[PDB]
Amino acid sequence: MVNIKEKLFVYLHDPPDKALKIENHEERSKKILSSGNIQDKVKQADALSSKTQRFIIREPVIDFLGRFHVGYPVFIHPISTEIKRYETLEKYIDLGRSNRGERFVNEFLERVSKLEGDVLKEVFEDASNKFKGEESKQWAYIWQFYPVKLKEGVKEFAKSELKLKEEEAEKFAEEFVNLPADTRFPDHAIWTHLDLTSALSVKDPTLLRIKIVPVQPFIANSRKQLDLWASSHLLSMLMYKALEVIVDKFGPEHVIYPSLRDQPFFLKFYLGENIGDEILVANLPNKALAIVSGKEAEKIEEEIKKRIRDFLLQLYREAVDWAVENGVVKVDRSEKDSMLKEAYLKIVREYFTVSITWVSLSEKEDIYQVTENAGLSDEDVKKWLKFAEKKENSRVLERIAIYPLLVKILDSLGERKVTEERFEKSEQLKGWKCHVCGENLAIFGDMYDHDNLKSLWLDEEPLCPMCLIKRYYPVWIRSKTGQKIRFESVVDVALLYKNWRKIFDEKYGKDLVSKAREVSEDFVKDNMLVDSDLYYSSTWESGLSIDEEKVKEVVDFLNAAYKEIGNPPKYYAILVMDGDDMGKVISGEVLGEISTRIHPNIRDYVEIPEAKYYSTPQVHVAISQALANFSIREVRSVVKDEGLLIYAGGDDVLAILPVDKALEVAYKIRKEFGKSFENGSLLPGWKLSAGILIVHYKHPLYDALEKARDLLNNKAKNVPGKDTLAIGLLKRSGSYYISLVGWELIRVFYNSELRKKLLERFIYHVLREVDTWPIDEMLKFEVIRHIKEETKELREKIYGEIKDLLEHVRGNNEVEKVRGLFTFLKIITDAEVFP
Numbered sequence: 001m002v003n004i005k006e007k008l009f010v011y012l013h014d015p016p017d018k019a020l021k022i023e024n025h026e027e028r029s030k031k032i033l034s035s036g037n038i039q040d041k042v043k044q045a046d047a048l049s050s051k052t053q054r055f056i057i058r059e060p061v062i063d064f065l066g067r068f069h070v071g072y073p074v075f076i077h078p079i080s081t082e083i084k085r086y087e088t089l090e091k092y093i094d095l096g097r098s099n100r101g102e103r104f105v106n107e108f109l110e111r112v113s114k115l116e117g118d119v120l121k122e123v124f125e126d127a128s129n130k131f132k133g134e135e136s137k138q139w140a141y142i143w144q145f146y147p148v149k150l151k152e153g154v155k156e157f158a159k160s161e162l163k164l165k166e167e168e169a170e171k172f173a174e175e176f177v178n179l180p181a182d183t184r185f186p187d188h189a190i191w192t193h194l195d196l197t198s199a200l201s202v203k204d205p206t207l208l209r210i211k212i213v214p215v216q217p218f219i220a221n222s223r224k225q226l227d228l229w230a231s232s233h234l235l236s237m238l239m240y241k242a243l244e245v246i247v248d249k250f251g252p253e254h255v256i257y258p259s260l261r262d263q264p265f266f267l268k269f270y271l272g273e274n275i276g277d278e279i280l281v282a283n284l285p286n287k288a289l290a291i292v293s294g295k296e297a298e299k300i301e302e303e304i305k306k307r308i309r310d311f312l313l314q315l316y317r318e319a320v321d322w323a324v325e326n327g328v329v330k331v332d333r334s335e336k337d338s339m340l341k342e343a344y345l346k347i348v349r350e351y352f353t354v355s356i357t358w359v360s361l362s363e364k365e366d367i368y369q370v371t372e373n374a375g376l377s378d379e380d381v382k383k384w385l386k387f388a389e390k391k392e393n394s395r396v397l398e399r400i401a402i403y404p405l406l407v408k409i410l411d412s413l414g415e416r417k418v419t420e421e422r423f424e425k426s427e428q429l430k431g432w433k434c435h436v437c438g439e440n441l442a443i444f445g446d447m448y449d450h451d452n453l454k455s456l457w458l459d460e461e462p463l464c465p466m467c468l469i470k471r472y473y474p475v476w477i478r479s480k481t482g483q484k485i486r487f488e489s490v491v492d493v494a495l496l497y498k499n500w501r502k503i504f505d506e507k508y509g510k511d512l513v514s515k516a517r518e519v520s521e522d523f524v525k526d527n528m529l530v531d532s533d534l535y536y537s538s539t540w541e542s543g544l545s546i547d548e549e550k551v552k553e554v555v556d557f558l559n560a561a562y563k564e565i566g567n568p569p570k571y572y573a574i575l576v577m578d579g580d581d582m583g584k585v586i587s588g589e590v591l592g593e594i595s596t597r598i599h600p601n602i603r604d605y606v607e608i609p610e611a612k613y614y615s616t617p618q619v620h621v622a623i624s625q626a627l628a629n630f631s632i633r634e635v636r637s638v639v640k641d642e643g644l645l646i647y648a649g650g651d652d653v654l655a656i657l658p659v660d661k662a663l664e665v666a667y668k669i670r671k672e673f674g675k676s677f678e679n680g681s682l683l684p685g686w687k688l689s690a691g692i693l694i695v696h697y698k699h700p701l702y703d704a705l706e707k708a709r710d711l712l713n714n715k716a717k718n719v720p721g722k723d724t725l726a727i728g729l730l731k732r733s734g735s736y737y738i739s740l741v742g743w744e745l746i747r748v749f750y751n752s753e754l755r756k757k758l759l760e761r762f763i764y765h766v767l768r769e770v771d772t773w774p775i776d777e778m779l780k781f782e783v784i785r786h787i788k789e790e791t792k793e794l795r796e797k798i799y800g801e802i803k804d805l806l807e808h809v810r811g812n813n814e815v816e817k818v819r820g821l822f823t824f825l826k827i828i829t830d831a832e833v834f835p
């Protein structure tokens with residue numbers, strides 16, 4: 001139901017360069033739109049936005065080209081409260097004003113508006129050319145690529161017409177595109193404001209919350225890395241199928257969370273853009289927030305559920321066909337027909353529960369009634385409401401004025417629904433269970449004895465419908481995107497340690513392949529080993545799936561290689577990260593004081609309640625965009641091809657890394673999640689906790705994921721103030737070493753001379769002594785004990801370093817701190833884990 005002209009008008013009610021001049025900005029919007037159409041609903045949208053405002057200006061103006069003017073405008077990070085100044089823009093504007101004054105102002109404005117109009121026209125043309133039939137895809141394309149093409153055009157304008165250097169031009173454009181929407185409260189960029197106006201320009205706008213469950217039972221129950229990735233990615237695809245409805249009916253700017261801008265799924269499967277291996281990463285969470293017209297709410301709920309069910313069923317059908325064709329199931333046409341029986345289709349149908357809930361944004365009601373019935377009543381909240389009541393002179397208001405609490409409310413309701421629908425879930429047939437998961441009925445399981453059931457399946461491994469879908473999914477992604485993950489096995493990731501696989505392939509690869517051929521022709525496929533574990537001599541020594549004792553020759557060959565280039569890495573690392581109190585960040589209760597959000601100069605001219613800063617919807621959109629930038633760009637940039645980044649949607653991250661790269665990667669992802677700005681774009685100015693679990697490759701994956709999630713949720717997030725890294729080493733021995741450590745310790749230790757000496761006895765004795773010991777003296781004794789002019793310096797320096805490191809260790813008393821620090825030291829200094 002998308003009409004592109006009206007959408008362009010209501011969207012560009014304000015110009016992108018509103019920050020540049022506040023005076024007569026509607027006129028510039030009229031010029032930009034003049035290329036398209038002629039410049040209502042926007043009034044209602046503006047009023048609804050105005051209801052969220054928590055200020056009364058006591059009239060001051062902040063503007064680059066203004067004439068009472070209170071100075072140039074800056075940008076303030078919503079979470080960080082860090083101030084970002086438009087340096088290049090400021091300089092150029094100042095020099096221009098100095099040289100030609102007002103004439104320069106009008107001429108420059110006319111030029112800039114001419115450029116924005118041009119770019120808008122070109123983009124519109126591209127949209128109409130690429131998507132002739134469908135207006136929805138057109139608007140999606142325009143909304144997506146407009147700020148980009150604008151950035152390129154402004155960069156060209158600065159480089160050519162203004163004769164600026166490459167760096168200065170890039171800065172000029174990046175600062176131009178990321179201008180604020182309200183110079184008084186530069187929490188958010190102009191684009192998020194445009195998005196909100198367009199979203200709220202619809203009749204009876206309502207807030208829609210979507211949740212798809214279960215995440216963990218589906219994901220964490222994986223036996224293979226490929227199955228894990230498949231699970232995460234399939235979940236993300238389900239969320240994309242859900243959001244596709246919203247994008248179709250309304251547009252991408254209607255989705256508050258997650259932000260759809262630069263989303264690989266949105267770009268590839270909707271805008272048809274050609275995408276690389278970045279599509280392999282799962283960037284969409286299982287929770288979503290959108291703005292939808294009130295009349296069409298239920299219809300859209302049914303439509304989302306319908307699309308998800310249908311997609312899953314088609315996926316299952318294609319899966320069945322694939323399985324029958326490639327020999328995954330050795331079956332005849334009658335049985336193939338039986339594979340699609342109502343029971344299995346029903347399993348597929350009812351596995352995923354989708355809870356959609358909504359609340360009208362513009363239906364007036366008592367603020368206090370809403371919050372009290374909700375139970376969201378703090379001392380701060382009461383003041384926050386009182387200010388609104390006094391400002392609007394009305395006790396009852398549109399509930400959008402209580403937007404943050406509303407979201408909370410919605411979440412609550414959603415949660416309950418999740419339970420209810422789960423209670424009314426039909427029991428599953430009684431039968432033999434899937435060999436992969438062990439919780440779902442296997443196909444043919446109800447109809448056959450276990451032996452016969454085993455005979456029907458490849459490698460004697462019966463599959464449930466969901467696991468069959470899960471097995472077919474990588475082929476499906478390969479067909480739809482031309483992409484497959486670089487590392488299929490967990491051993492693939494483990495062997496990245498010190499480039500062991502590359503070095504070994506280069507030196508002894510062909511010989512290992514040939515001797516493998518000597519043992520059997522099954523082990524070698526496409527001149528490569530069919531499985532990576534065949535790189536280990538142990539696999540050949542014992543368990544295999546007889547043959548001549550030539551296998552032993554291979555083994556000795558491998559052992560010889562191990563003598564020459566070192567032993568192969570049998571350990572890998574699971575990195576699971578999550579943001580600290582993210583919900584409280586979004587609601588804004590943790591974020592702190594409201595005063596910091598205002599431009600410093602107008603602090604006196606504006607009246608503000610003595611209460612917490614609860615997030616306006618534009619702030620929510622801003623933060624969503626920040627999380628999208630982080631997950632889509634930064635995390636993937638850090639991991640690169642050093643490992644496998646399975647999932648990255650907003651705050652939470654899931655990746656499999658080699659043991660050497662794990663700590664660096666985790667620390668750098670945390671560092672980048674710390675940054676407030678990268679170029680023009682925003683980043684989360686916040687903190688996250690993580691869990692790193694080092695596991696032997698033979699260990700069952702589901703248990704490893706369990707212990708990793710355990711490390712993150714029960715260890716790292718249970719520390720006051722959080723922001724901790726929980727490192728666990730689970731040796732084949734069965735011994736489990738856990739160390740709780742602050743992020744800085746990684747950097748300090750990497751810088752420490754202690755590391756240099758350690759890499760090029762002590763730790764064991766320290767752990768032995770701590771338990772019985774009654775401490776700085778106790779430490780000093782041992783440091784002196786294990787470590788001629790040089791030695792006093794080295795003892796003093798390493799004791800100093802240990803003293804520094806102990807500070808960053810998560811322990812409540814020094815006994816704890818030493819135990820943790822030296823547990824960490826035990827973890828790194830393991831000859832088995834770090835050859």
Ligand SMILES: [Mn+2]
Pocket residue numbers: 013014046
């Ligand atoms: Mn406006």
Ligand SMILES: [Mn+2]
Pocket residue numbers: 013014025026
């Ligand atoms: Mn306006």
Ligand SMILES: [Mn+2]
Pocket residue numbers: 578579582651652
């Ligand atoms: Mn999270």
Ligand SMILES: [Mn+2]
Pocket residue numbers: 634672678
């Ligand atoms: Mn970066």
Ligand SMILES: [Zn+2]
Pocket residue numbers: 434435436437438439440463464465466467468
């Ligand atoms: Zn299964």
